[PDB]
Amino acid sequence: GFLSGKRILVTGVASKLSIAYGIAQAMHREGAELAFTYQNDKLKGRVEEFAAQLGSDIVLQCDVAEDASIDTMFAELGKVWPKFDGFVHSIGFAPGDQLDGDYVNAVTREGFKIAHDISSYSFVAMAKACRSMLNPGSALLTLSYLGAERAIPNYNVMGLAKASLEANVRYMANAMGPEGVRVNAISAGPIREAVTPIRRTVTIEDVGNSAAFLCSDLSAGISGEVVHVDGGFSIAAMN
Amino acid sequence: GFLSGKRILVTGVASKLSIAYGIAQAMHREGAELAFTYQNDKLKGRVEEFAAQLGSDIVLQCDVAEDASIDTMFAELGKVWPKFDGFVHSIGFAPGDQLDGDYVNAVTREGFKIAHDISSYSFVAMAKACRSMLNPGSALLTLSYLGAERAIPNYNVMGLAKASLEANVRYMANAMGPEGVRVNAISAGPIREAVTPIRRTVTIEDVGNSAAFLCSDLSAGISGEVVHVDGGFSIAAMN
Amino acid sequence: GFLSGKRILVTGVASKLSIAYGIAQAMHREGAELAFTYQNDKLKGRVEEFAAQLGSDIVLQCDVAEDASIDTMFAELGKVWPKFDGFVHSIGFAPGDQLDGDYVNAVTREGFKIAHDISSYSFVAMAKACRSMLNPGSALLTLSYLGAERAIPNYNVMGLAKASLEANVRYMANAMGPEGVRVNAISAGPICEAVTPIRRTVTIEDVGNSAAFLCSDLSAGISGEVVHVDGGFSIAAMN
Amino acid sequence: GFLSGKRILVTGVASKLSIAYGIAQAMHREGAELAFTYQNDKLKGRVEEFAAQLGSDIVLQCDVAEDASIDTMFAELGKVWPKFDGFVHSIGFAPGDQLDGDYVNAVTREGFKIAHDISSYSFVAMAKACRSMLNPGSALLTLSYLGAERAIPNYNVMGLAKASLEANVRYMANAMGPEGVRVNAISAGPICEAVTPIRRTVTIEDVGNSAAFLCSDLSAGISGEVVHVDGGFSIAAMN
Numbered sequence: 009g010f011l012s013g014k015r016i017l018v019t020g021v022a023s024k025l026s027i028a029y030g031i032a033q034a035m036h037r038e039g040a041e042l043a044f045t046y047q048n049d050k051l052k053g054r055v056e057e058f059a060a061q062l063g064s065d066i067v068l069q070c071d072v073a074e075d076a077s078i079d080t081m082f083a084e085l086g087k088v089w090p091k092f093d094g095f096v097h098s099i100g101f102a103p104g105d106q107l108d109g110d111y112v113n114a115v116t117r118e119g120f121k122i123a124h125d126i127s128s129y130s131f132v133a134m135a136k137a138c139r140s141m142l143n144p145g146s147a148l149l150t151l152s153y154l155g156a157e158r159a160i161p162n163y164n165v166m167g168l169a170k171a172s173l174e175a176n177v178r179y180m181a182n183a184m185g186p187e188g189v190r191v192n193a194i195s196a197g198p199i200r201e202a203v204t205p206i207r208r209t210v211t212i213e214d215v216g217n218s219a220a221f222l223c224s225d226l227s228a229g230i231s232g233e234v235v236h237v238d239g240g241f242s243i244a245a246m247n
Numbered sequence: 248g249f250l251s252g253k254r255i256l257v258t259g260v261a262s263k264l265s266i267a268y269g270i271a272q273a274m275h276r277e278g279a280e281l282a283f284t285y286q287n288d289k290l291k292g293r294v295e296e297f298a299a300q301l302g303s304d305i306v307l308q309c310d311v312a313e314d315a316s317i318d319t320m321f322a323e324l325g326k327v328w329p330k331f332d333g334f335v336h337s338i339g340f341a342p343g344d345q346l347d348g349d350y351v352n353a354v355t356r357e358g359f360k361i362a363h364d365i366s367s368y369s370f371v372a373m374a375k376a377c378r379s380m381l382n383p384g385s386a387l388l389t390l391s392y393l394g395a396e397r398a399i400p401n402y403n404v405m406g407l408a409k410a411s412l413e414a415n416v417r418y419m420a421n422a423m424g425p426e427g428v429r430v431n432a433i434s435a436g437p438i439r440e441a442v443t444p445i446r447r448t449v450t451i452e453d454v455g456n457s458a459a460f461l462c463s464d465l466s467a468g469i470s471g472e473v474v475h476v477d478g479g480f481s482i483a484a485m486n
Numbered sequence: 487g488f489l490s491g492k493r494i495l496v497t498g499v500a501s502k503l504s505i506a507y508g509i510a511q512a513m514h515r516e517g518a519e520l521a522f523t524y525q526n527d528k529l530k531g532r533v534e535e536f537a538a539q540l541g542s543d544i545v546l547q548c549d550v551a552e553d554a555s556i557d558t559m560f561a562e563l564g565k566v567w568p569k570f571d572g573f574v575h576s577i578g579f580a581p582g583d584q585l586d587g588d589y590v591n592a593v594t595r596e597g598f599k600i601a602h603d604i605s606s607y608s609f610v611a612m613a614k615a616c617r618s619m620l621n622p623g624s625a626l627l628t629l630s631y632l633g634a635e636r637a638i639p640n641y642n643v644m645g646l647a648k649a650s651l652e653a654n655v656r657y658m659a660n661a662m663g664p665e666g667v668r669v670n671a672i673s674a675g676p677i678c679e680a681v682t683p684i685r686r687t688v689t690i691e692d693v694g695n696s697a698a699f700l701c702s703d704l705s706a707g708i709s710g711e712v713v714h715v716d717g718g719f720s721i722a723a724m725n
Numbered sequence: 726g727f728l729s730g731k732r733i734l735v736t737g738v739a740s741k742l743s744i745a746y747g748i749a750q751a752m753h754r755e756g757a758e759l760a761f762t763y764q765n766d767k768l769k770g771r772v773e774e775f776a777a778q779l780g781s782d783i784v785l786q787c788d789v790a791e792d793a794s795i796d797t798m799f800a801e802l803g804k805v806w807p808k809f810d811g812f813v814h815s816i817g818f819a820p821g822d823q824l825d826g827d828y829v830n831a832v833t834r835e836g837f838k839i840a841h842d843i844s845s846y847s848f849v850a851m852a853k854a855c856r857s858m859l860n861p862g863s864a865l866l867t868l869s870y871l872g873a874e875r876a877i878p879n880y881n882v883m884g885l886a887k888a889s890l891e892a893n894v895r896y897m898a899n900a901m902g903p904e905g906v907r908v909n910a911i912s913a914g915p916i917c918e919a920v921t922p923i924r925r926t927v928t929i930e931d932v933g934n935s936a937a938f939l940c941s942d943l944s945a946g947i948s949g950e951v952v953h954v955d956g957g958f959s960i961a962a963m964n
């Protein structure tokens with residue numbers, strides 16, 4: 009399919025429900041050779057099994073909180089893919105207390121720091137560590153959400169981290185474009201209705217197919233873009 | 248390819264340089280069966296020849312200035328495609344005096360009326376006339392430009408017509424979504440550099456591949472969206 | 487007041503409830519000398535009544551559907567004010583059956599034409615006709631609505647006209663800026679209470695106060711801008 | 726003046742050139758009683774000098790990197806003002822080598838952390854610490870830049886921090902709105918002349934005038950908004 013010839017690193021697979029699992033399935037279906045990271049010992053086996061099902065045995069530890077963990081992961085990847093064609097960043101975190109109740113009362117310096125570090129800084133952290141490894145025609149992809157652009161109850165400091173992430177997409181697109189690298193985001197709708205134009209929530213298949221496109225040469229003209237894959241939800245009001 | 252099974256009507260082919268020609272080529276490459284309209288007697292032969300080269304002999308007259316011309320075209324199409332899966336609207340016009348010099352001095356009531364009528368109203372005019380003919384899963388596509396969002400010298404009243412067109416995308420997406428129809432726009436970069444992140448202007452191949460995606464089931468999650476296919480130009484400043 | 491020494495023409499006063507009324511009130515409070523237009527003879531007396539209360543006896547007929555009516559209004563105005571400091575455009579119209587039900591079904595070529603002509607073209611028609619009369623430091627103001635940016639049920643074709651209007655703000659600002667004229671819009675909330683950050687609907691006073699600022703030299707740094715005066719409604723979601 | 730009866734805290738006065746200075750001046754002109762903070766002992770005298778000229782002897786140390794410093798500042802302030810009417814946040818910082826050259830190369834985890842903590846988290850840190858002190862009708866104001874929305878060379882990680890900041894405006898506006906507090910930002914132009922619609926760079930006076938409006942009850946209808954005070958620069962392209 010339209011990704012044949014392409015080697016893509018997929019982060020953030022934690023289950024069959026993971027957006028990153030929808031994405032990996034779509035990309036494998038389209039001929040991509042895939043590699044996988046897992047955060048910790050808890051997730052290793054699950055990811056190894058998913059990776060084997062998608063014809064891959066590149067399954068590498070990466071905790072994006074640590075610069076050393078990222079560098080080590082890309083050194084391991086280089087033994088088998090001295091060059092590759094980009095990555096899917098489907099990662100973020102905020103401490104649980106951050107994401108419930110009044111935003112101003114919930115947010116703390118430490119919660120803000122972690123949300124921004126894991127959910128925004130890590131995208132460019134990965135880009136920096138693998139920069140010389142990317143072929144011309146490479147594409148990077150991250151996942152965002154409408155809370156970056158609107159104040160959504162409870163989403164709280166993650167809205168700010170996502171806004172930071174979307175700016176990071178633009179700054180990265182601008183920096184790496186001259187070396188033949190594109191950088192985009194998908195702003196996905198919430199994954200499981202009456203107010204969405206298409207009258208349903210998007211599925212990880214929808215998200216996956218858009219992701220496959222944005223990482224393929226089919227999207228050669230698209231960079232620094234946040235594409236809304238939310239069924240039109242964000243463009244409607246008072247439906 | 249990813250458009251097999253799909254019947255798409257393509258408007259706006261006037262030459263090999265036409266965006267709509269890039270789009271038709273991409274879609275044919277991906278397995279779509281195509282139909283074509285031509286504005287007038289001058290363009291008929293060129294379009295017939297392009298259509299034959301892309302395995303089609305559905306070549307129908309349509310001048311979107313006239314409600315009768317549109318209805319007649321869709322009656323002719325119905326004899327051969329009683330149902331189809333959407334259309335590509337790659338059409339607009341403003342009188343030549345509109346598009347040069349100071350916007351306020353150039354614009355006239357009549358120029359504004361024509362620019363908006365041909366370049367914005369015609370998208371929904373076509374949708375209205377073929378509404379009952381569209382299958383569930385249908386996609387409509389139009390072409391826009393950054394002048395809808397920024398004031399660009401000389402682009403003048405067409406900027407306003409394009410802003411109207413982009414709103415029309417949202418309103419149409421919202422109206423037709425419940426019947427299984429998606430509606431998007433591509434905001435293409437100018438087609439033939441130092442300031443664009445990807446360091447080149449997009450080509451009708453870039454535009455065509457994005458268009459093929461947006462009219463395919465691969466983009467099932469995307470509606471009422473204006474996707475920038477301009478190489479990142481609009482997201483950079485002072486480059 | 488912060489409008490002392492300013493002469494501002496105000497269109498669209500139709501009653502004591504009109505947004506244009508709240509605007510005229512706030513401007514008069516702030517030291518502006520005002521002039522008023524009215525659409526037809528049906529409203530001549532009533533508008534003379536309002537102008538009276540606001541220190542004005544400059545009351546002129548103007549139907550923005552006609553170039554000759556606009557021209558003759560500014561000629562009359564020129565007899566009292568050979569120079570003045572800008573105007574407020576608070577005018578718009580679509581035929582009634584445009585504004586009910588499914589957009590794609592309701593919209594017609596003629597309904598589209600009128601909505602755009604009266605609600606968008608008229609803004610620049612007015613600027614063209616008084617361009618040579620404007621002092622340096624002049625400001626033009628129009629009134630938009632969130633329907634320009636989002637698909638709102640029943641707002642239908644007015645959404646497109648308002649999008650054309652906001653583009654018109656940008657193109658006008660760009661063209662007239664160099665001779666010292668600013669051009670802006672206010673996107674007002676409806677005159678919703680439950681989901682607005684400020685937990686109330688805005689008033690003609692809130693709107694009038696922002697209008698007065700945007701036509702004064704206090705807003706000297708602001709041009710080409712759509713200022714949302716809707717209590718934050720448009721930046722919130724799922725409240 | 727239109728700020729009579731208001732008590733507003735102003736951060737970020739570092740010299741007579743500071744945007745915060747132009748803001749304090751405009752507010753004092755309009756009848757506001759002011760208080761000032763300063764970052765370190767290096768600036769204590771100089772800021773007392775400015776406060777003096779602006780009818781104020783409320784001058785308090787505050788380093789926004791520390792929760793205890795913010796807490797102790799608002800405790801001191803509480804002795805003169807048990808209640809007040811909001812504050813201006815005109816504070817931000819990235820280590821210097823963050824702001825030069827290719828973004829992906831310059832950015833580090835620590836540089837990112839600091840930029841976001843000082844330029845974005847501090848805004849909400851301040852709101853949290855004085856939340857119970859704010860009168861109904863209070864307004865908070867921060868200062869952003871177009872780098873939040875576009876990739877600007879060398880602005881680098883500050884672009885992400887400002888995007889986080891503008892999201893913070895929205896989330897703060899949403900959370901504090903119901904108790905009668907508004908929150909907005911001004912995105913100021915640089916303090917370019919050739920491509921700005923108004924053909925000049927904006928001044929600390931233009932900025933100060935818009936700031937004064939946005940902290941006054943005149944802007945009662947405006948919350949959650951980023952107001953561009955850049956002479957229209959961001960709405961123009963290819964000028």
Ligand SMILES: [N]C(=O)C1=[C][N+]([C]2O[C]([C]OP(=O)([O-])OP([O])(=O)O[C][C]3O[C](N4[C]=NC5=C4N=[C]N=C5[N])[C]([O])[C]3[O])[C]([O])[C]2O[B@@]2([O])C3=C([C]=[C][C]=[C]3)[C]=NN2C([N])=S)=[C][C]=[C]1
Binds near residue numbers: 020099100
């Ligand atoms: N879901 C939905 O709806 C959505 C989502 N979004 C986004 O995307 C992404 C992804 O997610 P998901 O797939 O869903 O989830 P999960 O599966 O859980 O995943 C995550 C991941 O990450 C990782 N990590 C963490 N931390 C870390 C990591 N790695 C490495 N290192 C470190 N340190 C784990 O492991 C996993 O795998 C995301 O980003 C999202 O976002 B959010 O915010 C959201 C959600 C939901 C909704 C909305 C939003 C969730 N979550 N999140 C986060 N996490 S941040 C988008 C849209 C939609």
Ligand SMILES: [N]C(=O)C1=[C][N+]([C]2O[C]([C]OP(=O)([O-])OP([O])(=O)O[C][C]3O[C](N4[C]=NC5=C4N=[C]N=C5[N])[C]([O])[C]3[O])[C]([O])[C]2O[B@@]2([O])C3=C([C]=[C][C]=[C]3)[C]=NN2C([N])=S)=[C][C]=[C]1
Binds near residue numbers: 265266290439
């Ligand atoms: N090019 C570029 O760069 C671009 C473009 N854009 C858009 O898209 C569209 C399409 O275009 P093109 O392809 O390029 O061109 P042509 O070829 O010429 O085509 C057109 C068409 O249309 C038609 N018509 C007209 N009128 C009519 C018709 N049909 C029917 N009926 C009627 N009445 C003809 O025939 C032809 O075929 C468009 O839309 C565009 O836009 B614009 O504005 C632009 C340009 C350039 C640049 C920019 C923009 C051109 N043109 N235009 C118009 N026309 S409106 C987008 C982006 C880019």
Ligand SMILES: [N]C(=O)C1=[C][N+]([C]2O[C]([C]OP(=O)([O-])OP([O])(=O)O[C][C]3O[C](N4[C]=NC5=C4N=[C]N=C5[N])[C]([O])[C]3[O])[C]([O])[C]2O[B@@]2([O])C3=C([C]=[C][C]=[C]3)[C]=NN2C([N])=S)=[C][C]=[C]1
Binds near residue numbers: 501
């Ligand atoms: N309301 C609300 O909420 C709003 C509104 N907006 C806008 O603003 C403007 C103004 O309106 P109002 O004030 O509201 O109302 P009125 O009083 O009725 O006014 C109107 C005016 O106009 C004029 N005209 C007409 N036609 C014509 C004229 N002139 C001349 N010529 C001609 N042809 C009359 O007379 C009067 O005075 C407007 O623009 C508005 O918009 B809309 O769309 C809307 C509404 C509602 C809501 C939303 C929107 C209503 N209406 N509209 C129209 N009409 S266009 C804004 C915001 C809000």
Ligand SMILES: [N]C(=O)C1=[C][N+]([C]2O[C]([C]OP(=O)([O-])OP([O])(=O)O[C][C]3O[C](N4[C]=NC5=C4N=[C]N=C5[N])[C]([O])[C]3[O])[C]([O])[C]2O[B@@]2([O])C3=C([C]=[C][C]=[C]3)[C]=NN2C([N])=S)=[C][C]=[C]1
Binds near residue numbers: 739868
């Ligand atoms: N300039 C211009 O053009 C602009 C600006 N913007 C903004 O605003 C603000 C303020 O700034 P300015 O006034 O300009 O400056 P200054 O005077 O130097 O100020 C600063 C301040 O802060 C403070 N701090 C620091 N650190 C700290 C503090 N406090 C406390 N704690 C701590 N740790 C000091 O002391 C002073 O006072 C800002 O925010 C700005 O932003 B940015 O970014 C920018 C610039 C330029 C341009 C653009 C942007 C500069 N800078 N920056 C910073 N820093 S962040 C806006 C617009 C415009």
